[PDB]
Amino acid sequence: CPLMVKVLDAVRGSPAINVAVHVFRKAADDTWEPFASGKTSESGELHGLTTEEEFVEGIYKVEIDTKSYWKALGASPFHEHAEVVFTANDSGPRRYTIAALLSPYSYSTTAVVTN
Amino acid sequence: CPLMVKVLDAVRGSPAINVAVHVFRKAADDTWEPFASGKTSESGELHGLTTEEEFVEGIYKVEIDTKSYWKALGASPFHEHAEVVFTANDSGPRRYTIAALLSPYSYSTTAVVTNP
Amino acid sequence: CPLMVKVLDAVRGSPAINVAVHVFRKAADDTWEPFASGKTSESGELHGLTTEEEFVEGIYKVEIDTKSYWKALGASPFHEHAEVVFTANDSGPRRYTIAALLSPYSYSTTAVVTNP
Amino acid sequence: CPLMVKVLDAVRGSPAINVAVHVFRKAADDTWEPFASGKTSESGELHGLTTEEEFVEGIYKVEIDTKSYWKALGASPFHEHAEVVFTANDSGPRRYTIAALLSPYSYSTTAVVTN
């Protein structure tokens, strides 16, 4: 699996479960076109987003619909969503894990890129 | 100043200087329309982006140009930029401070919102 | 002020007010000796902990009493406190700002170090 | 496994590998006594720290020797180490994953507690 997304909840200290995640790739005319999407599991992870063949170099945006997540749990969300924008670079064989740590008014995201 | 941005470099333990920041605001046609932009100073802070009058209700997107910042310092960053999207002044004017902590492959961003 | 602490609440998007902070400094016998303590103000900042004269070289430990802070606000935090340990003024006096971002089960802490 | 530790490197966007981790439990006289320790693997993880039987309620401190880690890679570390202090509470069945994200002058730590 070339691209993984893991989402954690910093309030409850648990994985962010029923979370919608949309991945877009930047089209030649700079528009963002749907690339992949899904909902985090009970482990806060989303696998099977794409395949090695489809995941070509280019700019990608991982959009995490955090607002709905926090609303369900009664917290008042700050962000509309979390946006992770990056360039997939082939240079060598790589796997991407976009990790996101969420709080109502804050979030962190790290990219773990392994061989 | 109703919208400020402060950026820190977690590798150097100092303000993130000369970081370009672009603010957009969702238009009626769901298009991201340019709202304001600037760059952080020696203290890693960006003030004067907009005024209370101009900063009306809306969904804003604050794009912090992290990639350009790291590249200029000789690093190989992962992200293109940090994108902070949020609805503003939904219940009256508020002062927003968008803080961002930067590392080549990871960044934190957290808003401090106060009633003026 | 050579050692400042600033704390933010990532759940409320505001300064972390009334947060007790205890500073210790490793003694000759490797014991943690009390150095200074205080609590953050309405702006989530703690100034006046020590002076340049008193803040000598050494390994310091800044304990941010996060648990007491969350409990008082009705939350069930994971950590007892945030512990920032670091060697200070190893190459001359420096001004240190220990910043901490708090959530019930997670916290970030990052130092901004500048030459006066 | 009751207690896990995962360490990531935010500079290189990879797991913090050869990292020493010491776990201490607070003794009745408030001193910190050795409880467990090891070195993160190639996946930046440390399993087998303790057993369900030995992991009793109490206050624990996870010390991550980050200074040596950064020195090896040529970065100038700020912290002597990362310290995660917490109370193990039985109330229900739980697993602890102490995650730490490291940067030379900054680090984050989250506690993921699952059933």
Side-chain angles (χ1 to χ4, degrees):
Chain A
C1 226
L3 182 70
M4 310 187 257
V5 175
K6 192 179 176 189
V7 193
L8 291 175
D9 183 321
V11 172
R12 290 154 47 112
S14 63
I17 287 143
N18 206 312
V19 192
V21 175
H22 293 268
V23 183
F24 305 90
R25 176 173 49 228
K26 216 173 187 189
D29 63 12
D30 270 21
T31 63
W32 288 105
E33 72 178 42
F35 176 79
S37 62
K39 286 200 140 196
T40 61
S41 61
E42 66 190 320
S43 57
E45 297 173 300
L46 179 48
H47 310 300
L49 278 172
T50 179
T51 61
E52 218 148 51
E53 310 277 40
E54 306 179 60
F55 201 50
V56 297
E57 290 186 308
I59 305 170
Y60 294 79
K61 173 168 68 180
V62 173
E63 196 169 81
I64 308 184
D65 303 339
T66 59
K67 196 185 186 185
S68 311
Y69 177 73
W70 291 118
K71 274 184 294 192
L73 307 172
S76 183
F78 172 68
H79 308 86
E80 283 302 290
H81 55 245
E83 292 215 7
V84 187
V85 182
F86 65 92
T87 294
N89 190 216
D90 273 347
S91 75
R94 325 255 49 187
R95 293 197 166 210
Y96 298 69
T97 294
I98 298 306
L101 182 56
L102 319 170
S103 291
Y105 277 71
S106 175
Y107 77 81
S108 178
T109 184
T110 177
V112 192
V113 178
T114 50
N115 181 303
Chain B
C1 195
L3 178 63
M4 299 154 276
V5 177
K6 194 200 182 82
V7 188
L8 295 180
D9 182 318
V11 172
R12 281 168 25 153
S14 70
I17 299 169
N18 289 153
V19 177
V21 183
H22 294 264
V23 181
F24 302 88
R25 170 159 174 300
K26 226 188 205 180
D29 61 16
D30 244 52
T31 274
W32 281 112
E33 220 194 305
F35 177 70
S37 65
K39 43 177 56 214
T40 64
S41 56
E42 290 171 331
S43 69
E45 307 188 313
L46 170 47
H47 302 283
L49 281 172
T50 185
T51 57
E52 327 197 71
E53 251 184 39
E54 174 182 292
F55 192 48
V56 299
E57 276 187 271
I59 299 181
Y60 292 79
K61 169 164 71 179
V62 175
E63 294 191 2
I64 301 179
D65 293 329
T66 67
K67 164 162 283 204
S68 295
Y69 169 77
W70 289 113
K71 295 177 82 283
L73 295 167
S76 260
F78 183 72
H79 315 93
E80 285 299 299
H81 48 258
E83 264 202 42
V84 188
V85 184
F86 66 102
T87 295
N89 314 299
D90 28 321
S91 293
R94 293 291 186 276
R95 291 190 168 200
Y96 302 76
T97 299
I98 300 302
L101 177 66
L102 319 180
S103 295
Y105 277 66
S106 173
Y107 71 81
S108 116
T109 258
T110 119
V112 178
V113 184
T114 60
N115 207 314
Chain C
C1 195
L3 178 63
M4 299 154 276
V5 177
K6 194 200 182 82
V7 188
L8 295 180
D9 182 318
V11 172
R12 281 168 25 153
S14 70
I17 299 169
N18 289 153
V19 177
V21 183
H22 294 264
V23 181
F24 302 88
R25 170 159 174 300
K26 226 188 205 180
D29 61 16
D30 244 52
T31 274
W32 281 112
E33 220 194 305
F35 177 70
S37 65
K39 43 177 56 214
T40 64
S41 56
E42 290 171 331
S43 69
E45 307 188 313
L46 170 47
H47 302 283
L49 281 172
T50 185
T51 57
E52 327 197 71
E53 251 184 39
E54 174 182 292
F55 192 48
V56 299
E57 276 187 271
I59 299 181
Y60 292 79
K61 169 164 71 179
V62 175
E63 294 191 2
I64 301 179
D65 293 329
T66 67
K67 164 162 283 204
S68 295
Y69 169 77
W70 289 113
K71 295 177 82 283
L73 295 167
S76 260
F78 183 72
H79 315 93
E80 285 299 299
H81 48 258
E83 264 202 42
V84 188
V85 184
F86 66 102
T87 295
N89 314 299
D90 28 321
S91 293
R94 293 291 186 276
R95 291 190 168 200
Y96 302 76
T97 299
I98 300 302
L101 177 66
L102 319 180
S103 295
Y105 277 66
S106 173
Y107 71 81
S108 116
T109 258
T110 119
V112 178
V113 184
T114 60
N115 207 314
Chain D
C1 226
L3 182 70
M4 310 187 257
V5 175
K6 192 179 176 189
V7 193
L8 291 175
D9 183 321
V11 172
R12 290 154 47 112
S14 63
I17 287 143
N18 206 312
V19 192
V21 175
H22 293 268
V23 183
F24 305 90
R25 176 173 49 228
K26 216 173 187 189
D29 63 12
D30 270 21
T31 63
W32 288 105
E33 72 178 42
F35 176 79
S37 62
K39 286 200 140 196
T40 61
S41 61
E42 66 190 320
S43 57
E45 297 173 300
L46 179 48
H47 310 300
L49 278 172
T50 179
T51 61
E52 218 148 51
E53 310 277 40
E54 306 179 60
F55 201 50
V56 297
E57 290 186 308
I59 305 170
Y60 294 79
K61 173 168 68 180
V62 173
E63 196 169 81
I64 308 184
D65 303 339
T66 59
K67 196 185 186 185
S68 311
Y69 177 73
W70 291 118
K71 274 184 294 192
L73 307 172
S76 183
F78 172 68
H79 308 86
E80 283 302 290
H81 55 245
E83 292 215 7
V84 187
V85 182
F86 65 92
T87 294
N89 190 216
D90 273 347
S91 75
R94 325 255 49 187
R95 293 197 166 210
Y96 298 69
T97 294
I98 298 306
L101 182 56
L102 319 170
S103 291
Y105 277 71
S106 175
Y107 77 81
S108 178
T109 184
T110 177
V112 192
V113 178
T114 50
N115 181 303

